[PDB]
From a paper:
We also determined the structure of a double mutant with improved catalytic efficiency toward 3′-deoxynucleosides and ribonucleosides, establishing a path to guide future NDT engineering which relies on modulating steric effects and electrostatics surrounding a conserved and essential catalytic glutamate residue. Our rationale was centered in (i) opening up the substrate binding pocket by mutating P40 and Y7 and (ii) and exploring additional hydrogen bonding interactions to better position a 2′-OH group by mutating A9 and V85. Figure c shows the complex structures of CtNDTY7F‑[name] and Cordycepin. A potential additional interaction between S9 and the catalytic E88 (distance 2.5 Å) is formed. This could be important to compensate for the loss in positioning previously conferred by Y7, mutated to a phenylalanine in this variant. In agreement with this, CtNDTY7F‑[name] showed an improvement on k cat/K M‑inosine of 8-fold in comparison to wild type, and a 2-fold improvement toward CtNDTY7F. The K D for Immucillin-H for the double mutant CtNDTY7F‑[name] is 590 μM, 7.5 times higher than the one determined for the wild-type protein, and close to the K M for inosine (620 μM), therefore binding in a substrate-like manner. On the top the overall tetramer is shown, and in the bottom a zoomed-in image of the substrate (cordycepin, dark blue) and mutated residues (marine blue), depicted here from CtNDTY7F‑[name]. We established a workflow to determine optimal reaction conditions and generated a mutant (CtNDTY7F‑[name]) with altered nucleoside substrate specificity toward 3′-deoxynucleosides and ribonucleoside substrates.
Numbering used by the authors:
A (entry chain D), C (entry chain C): 3 to 155
B (entry chain A): 2 to 153
D (entry chain B): 2 to 155
Write the structure that this text describes.
């Protein structure tokens, strides 16, 4: 099975972590994907020791190296800095890239993209919108990049 | 052959910041004998009247991070700029040298170890990461900090 | 019946609108408060005409003038600029102030408060944290400011 | 007697920004004959060794906004700074004169009319709001913009 790293800032808010993440994980898993979600995958880190921050950093770094694609939740103004670092790692490692934003605000300096142009550096010049999801219900669309990627095209 | 530093900042988005904040930093770096690639300057030959300009700038910045020796990332703001963060993650994944700059005294973090989100330090060592972390322009040329030591 | 203006950024994201806001609305309503939620209250605006943005701004401004207190959701780094404007209006108009933040990141310019000191300018020097709620489940606590407000204590 | 501008900005948080970005804006406003109240400077005499300093600064800033004639809000960033936004909201509710400054060319808005969150413009008129919206330091001096009309009763 293809491995998706689900990069989001939803683990920082108790309510967001509980209500927002599980539905996205389920949509992904219904496509046959193995989902790596960093907040859940790090729940067994000894939050006691002071080095936990460095341990989590390295664990997330390895999960990106070892995933097949990244599903980056890029809601908010601006998108979360941890998601962006992990997205930049994904781009540089030639992983598949999928972006999610159901926030309807536009926040960018260019007409082409709704966000800072670097978020799109790992996507094609034409047809990048096919990798850009704007609702949870769209994740399972057979006409979007995630489905096509699983099934060849 | 000079070492090449990609100077990643959000300062080009503001007319005033572009004019007054970047030159002092570029000059401090050039003083060390570094070749500075500053993405806003490096893309001023682009035709910003064509809609494809955004993709061309993305690919330029992507290529310049690939081709640099290290990144000097201005990570001021709450949060740090998302373009800088993508470029920083690229630099980490490609084993470039990493240097961080924050002269913002606000602390904005999940953890007690680091003043920012822990991912920004994933490419720095567990011990002694502070030596790569600059908190004022006047500190950039310090011979006790990681950028000078890396050059030599 | 006391009127709370529930100020939040959650109407900008489809998922956050449907999943995060109703639970907070219900917790406030269970205390016996009349909740004014600006995204719901503006859904009968004619959004085809360009001036809709001005109409929403004035309707929001009036709701804050006419409420008794503000319940400001100040998750995020930084908190939402619209919420902050409205918080600022509430402070100047001597409305009662209640803050909600279940995001565990600390992001502040000072040792005393968990956020930018100006968010607390309308709270008392002593006991400001009694107005600062950290989980949805805490909203109904008999020991916090909303309840004291409703029982005159 | 000079009109009083409260110059609200996040530039005091960064050593370089405080040193290089604020004085040119202060000078621009003073060139119009305005008295400028810049909160990072006005609070330099607070005793920052006592933990209550944050409460004293908050109250001092709150009082300055009550006592000013208008606010000049530097609303650069994505998003604009939350302390600036609180003070802007105070100024709107207190019927102060409102002037916004953004030389950030990123557009970051919920709507097609305004370049930023619509609530920042709630204190400005429906028509001609852009006359109060400055996009460069050099434009502060413009006799066609709101600061100058304000000072000449036009
Ligand atoms: N405290 C934390 N726990 C787990 N992942 C974290 C984290 N802080 C940052 N990250 C990583 O960066 C992203 C959110 O900032 C997603 C996650 O992989
Ligand atoms: N319009 C632009 N011009 C140049 N670089 C840009 C840019 N938008 C984003 N970037 C890249 O991403 C970072 C700033 O967000 C630094 C820069 O290299
Ligand atoms: N459509 C809208 N645009 C901006 N702000 C809005 C809004 N509807 C409601 N608001 C109020 O303004 C703040 C959101 O930015 C909090 C919210 O209560
Ligand atoms: N010394 C200081 N430290 C932090 N915030 C300060 C400050 N002086 C003033 N403030 C207020 O903090 C707010 C941050 O934008 C606005 C500003 O008026």
């Amino acid at each position: 099975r293809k491995i998706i790293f689900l990069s989001s800032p939803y683990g920082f808010s108790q309510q967001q972590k509980t209500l927002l993440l599980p539905p996205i994980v389920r949509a992904l898993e219904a496509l046959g994907i193995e989902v790596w979600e960093p907040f859940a995958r790090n729940n067994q880190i000894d939050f006691s020791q002071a080095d936990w921050a460095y341990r989590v950093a390295q664990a997330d770094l390895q999960d990106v190296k070892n995933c097949d694609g990244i599903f980056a939740v890029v809601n908010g103004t601006p998108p979360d800095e941890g998601v962006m670092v992990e997205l930049g790692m994904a781009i540089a490692l030639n992983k598949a890239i999928f972006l999610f934003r159901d926030d309807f605000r536009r926040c960018s300096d260019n007409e082409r993209y709704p966000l800072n142009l670097m978020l799109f550096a790992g996507l094609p010049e034409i047809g990048w919108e096919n990798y850009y999801y704007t609702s949870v219900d769209e994740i399972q669309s057979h006409d979007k990049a995630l489905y096509k990627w699983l099934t060849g095209m």
